[PDB]
């Protein structure tokens, strides 16, 4: 059985008010089919501007991060409550920039995800290995460890996992212009799906979306989208460009 | 010679869209004199809502945090460029919640501050010791170390320091309802001003604002404001309440 395809655009720390207005309008003007989930994640200060600019009935706005506590004395942090008050359904958790550059631990990412999921959000949960870890032949060990941390907070819970979208982004592919080959990406996605079937649920493994990120763009996404276990993309740099819309079209054509 | 008094309200991780609209309107309706700087720092997702609600010609909106890189691949982070594009002049850097709970290092806080100052922002730079550090009689050593980290990035630079407001908030006073006595606070502020005179500039020490935070509220702020070296307040919990306006009035009456 199959999955609703998913494409997310992570703007990261980019944008101005004028850009958000113009780019969100451009995406919203694209004919987005009802058969694919399309989500964009502007920087936190731009979320309300993006929501106001979003005239699409399909496009959804997401956050790039959320904290693991509710409202309270957490200077600089955003709560799930704040995001839901703004009408958001989606949030990115555990992006490799936060894990590897900003010191977000496996347990911290897992706790953020659990809190968001328990409150009814859809979490795009990111995992991935560094070039060093892949050279050491620890690719699956690393990715599985990141997921087992979420598993520790959610276990086998049903429908905690229902609204998880796993995003595999090899760290060596992020912003480097070095995309994983379809073979390399599919191999990891197969491994993640086997892990899910074994440690969570066999039926659940058939339904969970596992998307690929890391230098995914309009030129390479068709071949990735043709891989049985790659349900779509988490797009960084290309999400700031008109080619993001081309990717939506390619994903639709290849997987619906 | 003397200082323009400064009062900042840090909302921390609190608020909904409706609250921001209503509370910013309430503050903006207060008669704020031209003689005092009054700044409020909503959560990042609420900044644009607060800016739209702010009809005051005196009140300024500030951010609670900013990253130490420009725009780029920093998922979950906000750049100085983004804040300036939104028209903001002020940012809180090095809040003790970020230092002590979220692992922001002295050097990281210093680098954030330097970047913001170089771009023309006013930085509310927070320092403070824990109860453990004070028990160990290391209060001044800790606070000075946090400032020397900024000094390392700015040195004796003129007018890098011109737009710094130092905020002393003993960690044991944050959200605990245990305010420092005027005697305790003034003693630290004297120490910080002596440090500034010795390590930065004697004339500069006469002009830099050093504000107190940590359970400051409408009931205790007059006695603090009467201390020669306490130029105002960084207000947490009370900034979410109507008593914030009472504090503005008390600060004006005591220091102008």
Author numbering:
A (entry chain A), B (entry chain A): 2 to 257
Could you give the paper's own sentences about this structure?
TIM is a ubiquitous glycolytic enzyme whose active site and overall α8/β8 barrel domain structure are highly conserved; even so, structural differences in its interface region have been used to achieve specific inhibition of enzymes in parasites. Since Giardia lacks oxidative phosphorylation and depends on glycolysis as its major ATP source, it has been proposed that disrupting this pathway could hinder the survival of the parasite; therefore, glycolytic enzymes have been considered potential pharmacological targets. Our results indicated that derivatization of C222, a non-interfacial residue located near the surface of the protein and 10-15 Å away from the active site, specifically inactivates the enzyme. C222 is at the end of loop 7, with its lateral chain positioned in a hydrophobic pocket formed mainly by carbon atoms of residues N218, G219, E223, F234, M248, and I251.
WTC, C222NC, C222DC and C222KC rendered crystals suitable for diffraction which, with the exception of C222KC, generated good quality crystallographic data. WTC and C222NC produced high-resolution structures (1.6Å and 1.45Å, respectively), whereas C222DC was solved at a resolution of 2.7Å. In all cases the final maps were of good quality, as indicated by inspection of double difference maps. Remarkably, initial refinement stages yielded immediate interesting results; even though the three proteins were crystallized in presence of 2-PG 5 mM, only the WTC and C222NC structures displayed electronic densities that corresponded to bound ligand in the catalytic site. The structural comparison between WTC and C222NC showed that these structures are almost identical with a Cα RMSD of 0.38 Å2. The larger differences were observed in the region of residues 198-207, which corresponds to a small mobile loop in the middle of helix 6. In both structures the architecture of the catalytic site is conserved; the ligand is positioned correctly and the geometry of the active site residues is preserved. The kinetic and binding data indicated that modification of C222 induces conformational changes that are transmitted as far as 10-15 Å from position 222 to the buried active site (as measured from the sulfur atom of C222 to the 2-PG molecule in the crystal structure of WT GlTIM).
